[PDB]
Each structure stands twice: as C-alpha cells, then as structure tokens.
Amino acid sequence: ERPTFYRQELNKTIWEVPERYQNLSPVGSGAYGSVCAAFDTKTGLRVAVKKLSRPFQSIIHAKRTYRELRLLKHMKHENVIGLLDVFTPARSLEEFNDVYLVTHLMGADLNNIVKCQKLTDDHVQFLIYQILRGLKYIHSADIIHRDLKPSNLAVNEDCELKILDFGHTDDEMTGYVATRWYRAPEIMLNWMHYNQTVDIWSVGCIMAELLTGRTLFPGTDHIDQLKLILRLVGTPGAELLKKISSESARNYIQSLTQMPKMNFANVFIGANPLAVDLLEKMLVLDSDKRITAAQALAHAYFAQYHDPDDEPVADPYDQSFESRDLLIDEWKSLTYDEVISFVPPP
Numbered sequence: 189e190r191p192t193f194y195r196q197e198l199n200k201t202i203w204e205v206p207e208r209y210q211n212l213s214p215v216g217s218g219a220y221g222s223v224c225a226a227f228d229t230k231t232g233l234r235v236a237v238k239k240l241s242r243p244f245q246s247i248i249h250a251k252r253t254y255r256e257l258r259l260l261k262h263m264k265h266e267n268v269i270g271l272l273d274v275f276t277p278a279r280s281l282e283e284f285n286d287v288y289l290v291t292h293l294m295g296a297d298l299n300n301i302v303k304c305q306k307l308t309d310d311h312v313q314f315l316i317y318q319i320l321r322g323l324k325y326i327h328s329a330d331i332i333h334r335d336l337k338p339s340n341l342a343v344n345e346d347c348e349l350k351i352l353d354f355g356h357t358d359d360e361m362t363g364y365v366a367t368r369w370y371r372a373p374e375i376m377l378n379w380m381h382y383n384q385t386v387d388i389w390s391v392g393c394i395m396a397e398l399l400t401g402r403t404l405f406p407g408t409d410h411i412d413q414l415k416l417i418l419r420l421v422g423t424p425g426a427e428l429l430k431k432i433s434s435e436s437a438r439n440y441i442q443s444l445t446q447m448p449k450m451n452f453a454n455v456f457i458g459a460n461p462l463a464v465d466l467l468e469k470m471l472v473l474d475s476d477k478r479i480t481a482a483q484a485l486a487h488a489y490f491a492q493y494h495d496p497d498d499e500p501v502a503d504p505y506d507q508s509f510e511s512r513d514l515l516i517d518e519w520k521s522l523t524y525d526e527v528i529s530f531v532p533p534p
C-alpha cells in the first residue's frame with residue numbers, strides 16, 4: 189500500500205518522502221551526493237537517504253541510475269552497503285522521475301578515523317578483515333568495486349565496517365589527489381583489461397596507511413606515483429611486460445631503469461611480520477599473482493577473526509544489461525520495475 193508522502197526543501201531541491209522518515213538533515217556537505225540523515229520511525233533505524241539527481245537526463249545517466257539500483261538491490265552482506273528502502277512519490281511510470289535510496293546511517297568514513305595516525309595492529313586486523321569479507325562477497329558476484337579508498341569505507345563507533353560506492357573524470361585524477369593514490373597501476377595507466385584484483389591492490393594501500401598513518405603512494409601525478417610504486421615492488425619482469433597489451437604503456441615502462449623489489453620488513457618497521465607478509469602478497473605488480481579476497485581471509489594475520497562458515501558469497505548477479513544498448517525510456521522502465529518490485533529486508 190502506498191504511504192503518504194510529505195514535501196520539504198533541502199539540498200536546493202524538493203524532497204518528497206514517506207512520513208516514516210523524519211528529521212531529514214543534509215550530511216557530507218556534497219561529498220556523498222544529495223544525501224540526508226533521517227530517523228526511520230518504522231524500524232527505529234538512523235538512515236541515510238540519497239536522492240538521485242536528474243536520473244534520466246541522458247542514456248548514460250539513465251543506465252547509471254539502473255546500474256546503481258541493480259547493484260544496491262543485490263548487496264545483502266554485513267560489510268557491504270545494502271538497500272533498506274527505495275521509493276518514488278510517482279504513482280505511475282509516466283510521472284516517474286525521482287529515485288530515493290535508503291541505507292544505514294554510518295558514523296564516519298575511514299579517512300576521518302585514520303587522521304594522520306597509526307592504528308593498533310588489532311584495529312588494523314579487524315578493519316581489514318571486514319573489508320576483505322565484504323570484497324569476497326562482492327567479487328563472488330563478479331562485481332568489481334574499482335574505486336576502494338578510505339572515504340568509501342564507512343564505520344561506526346564499534347569499528348563495524350561497510351563498503352560504499354561499489355560498481356571519475358580526468359581532472360579529478362590529476363595531481364596530488366587521494367582519488368588516484370589507491371588505484372592499481374594497471375588501471376591508473378590503462379595497461380590491460382583489468383580484473384577483481386585491482387581491489388586487492390587498493391586494500392594493500394589502505395592496510396599500509398592504517399599501519400603507518402601515512403599514504404603508501406602519495407604521487408604528485410600519474411608518473412610520480414608509478415615511480416613510487418615501482419621503487420617498492422620493483423620494475424615489471426618480462427612476464428608482466430607481455431601482459432601489458434597497451435604497446436604505448438609497455439614501451440614507456442621499459443624506458444625506466446630496472447629496480448628490485450624492496451624488503452617490506454625494512455619498509456614497514458615495527459609492523460607485525462604477518463601484516464608484512466600479507467602486504468607483500470597484496471601489493472604484487474602482476475595482478476594475476478595477487479592474493480584474492482577469499483585467500484587473504486585465510487591468511488594467519490586474521491586468525492582471531494577468520495571463520496570459513498561465516499564468510500558468505502553472493503547470489504548470482506545478472507549484469508548482461510551492461511553490454512545492452514537501450515533508449516532512455518527503456519532504461520527508465522527497467523529502473524521503475526526494480527523500484528516497484530523492491531522487498532525490504534527483515
């Protein structure tokens with residue numbers, strides 16, 4: 189049955205939401221999108237409500253809207269942001285033009301927690317364990333995050349973690365920016381068609397930063413960052429070179445003076461030797477040889493948290509729509525169907 193909706197001006201747009209959602213207050217100051225905190229009187233939950241901006245203005249935007257709804261509707265895991273609710277004030281497909289997404293309100297993002305500070309090894313174990321647990325779930329559905337970084341890792345005061353934004357312009361990847369610091373080199377420099385292990389590179393970067401309080405590869409640009417990466421992990425061998433399908437990228441790589449891999453125990457002084465070992469297995473230049481999420485969970489570093497029976501995989505995720513070319517109204521109808529058919533979690 190259709191709830192009663194009420195109207196309110198918030199982020200210079202009119203939010204129209206069910207009565208159950210009270211005390212809407214904008215959060216993140218633009219960083220999370222058009223997002224409000226609210227109290228869900230039906231569940232007693234503090235929630236985050238995201239209103240999608242002009243979701244069907246173009247083919248690209250319409251498909252992107254469908255993509256996000258599909259992704260969020262699929263994710264049902266403790267360490268992954270899922271959907272508590274999705275709604276539209278529209279009574280039919282013809283008046284459908286706004287999409288509102290509801291999830292748990294989290295306390296902070298990881299960036300605001302690390303705050304130039306070393307975390308205790310125990311805190312690192314727990315946070316990384318949860319990230320890896322969430323990624324095992326995400327990867328098992330053949331979904332890649334592609335953009336893991338502290339700012340899309342949300343945490344409560346109990347240190348319980350959820351991953352946001354799973355599934356950027358040139359200007360915002362330019363220069364001394366956190367938007368690029370956690371990216372695998374193969375994706376940063378378009379070496380090849382990339383796979384799930386790009387996310388593992390990001391975890392390695394995050395893990396190191398939690399351990400030292402410092403960005404692992406704070407490159408001032410793409411080239412500076414590559415040099416920082418290669419100084420640590422060594423220049424690519426012949427084997428990886430072959431796999432760089434971009435002739436241009438491969439040619440540039442070979443112009444660099446060869447460097448051996450550094451000793452991680454000398455790089456991460458004082459760190460748990462098990463943490464060093466895992467970092468070594470995550471920060472492998474050849475993505476084929478990086479540890480997977482499922483493998484990392486079984487690493488001795490997570491002994492006090494690892495439970496093979498409590499690390500679920502995902503239902504199959506049909507993403508055949510990604511290779512599909514459709515019109516705006518067709519993407520819009522597909523999205524509408526997904527909104528209408530939503531069933532809230534117990």
Ligand SMILES: CS(=O)(=O)c1ccc(Cl)c(-c2n[nH]c3nc(Oc4ccc(F)cc4F)ncc23)c1
Nearest residue numbers: 215220236238289290291292293294296297342
């Ligand atoms: C205490 S706070 O300032 O309100 C705060 C701080 C940091 C974060 Cl990460 C958050 C936060 N909690 N839950 C979120 N969800 C999103 O994005 C959404 C993702 C899918 C949805 F269905 C709906 C969303 F709003 N963004 C940010 C958040 C809140």
